Paper text:
Here we report the investigation of the role of protein flexibility in the modulation of binding kinetics and equilibrium thermodynamics of drug binding to heat shock protein 90 ([name]). [name] is one of the most abundant proteins in the cytoplasm of eukaryotic cells, comprising 2–5% of cytosolic protein under non-stressed conditions. It is a ubiquitous molecular chaperone intimately involved in a variety of pathways, including cell signaling, proliferation and survival, and protein folding. The N-terminal domain of [name] (N-[name]) contains the nucleotide-binding site, which has been the target site for drugs interfering with ATP binding and ATPase activity. The unbound N-[name] has a highly flexible lid segment comprising residues 107–14137.
Numbering used by the authors: 16 to 224
Amino acid sequence: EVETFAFQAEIAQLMSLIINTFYSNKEIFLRELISNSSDALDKIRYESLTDPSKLDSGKELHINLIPNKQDRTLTIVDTGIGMTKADLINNLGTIAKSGTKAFMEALQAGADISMIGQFGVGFYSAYLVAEKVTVITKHNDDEQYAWESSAGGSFTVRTDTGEPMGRGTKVILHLKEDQTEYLEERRIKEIVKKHSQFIGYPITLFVEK
Ligand SMILES: CCCN(C)S(=O)(=O)c1cc(-c2n[nH]c(=O)n2-c2ccccc2F)c(O)cc1O
């Protein structure tokens, strides 16, 4: 069963700003999502130092980048801590409130959209390139869930029926028709090169056959 929720007013406002502002430096989305994946990997690695059984769901700690030209999707997979149902519906939105409000105030004061990460709301930059975002996630303490939004003020959460992922998060970006450059190997490599040194986990780019 699928449940539909409204985004918090400030998040809905930020999403409409990101979608409707003319902004050509769209490549920032990839650095933001990789940074988030790295933070989720730090979380599970840290927890595993006091409880090694936290890695029973998978010991490999990495990030995979999977472009798919046929489906027009860019998938970012990590084996981080994952997210609970409470994270998806409430708690991430609550933690984001101050940063979202502060980021929109900064933008009105002439700040650049590339500053989004400095406000802890980097995820929403995915809407610069994606018409729809699907997030499949699995936390040790909960079931596997699918979160999805095409913006427009709402998102859905459902228990995922698909392939079990063990632990971690898969972000599926359904790219806008004019944003297919982010499916090119050379383009992905170029973007990641301005970021991989700060990432303490292997980033593997899957080459299409
Ligand atoms: C509903 C959208 C969720 N995203 C796709 S996300 O927030 O960008 C994002 C989240 C995680 C994630 N898993 N576990 C966890 O704690 N995090 C996390 C990391 C950083 C900040 C807040 C967070 F919860 C991830 O592994 C990759 C992501 O792209």
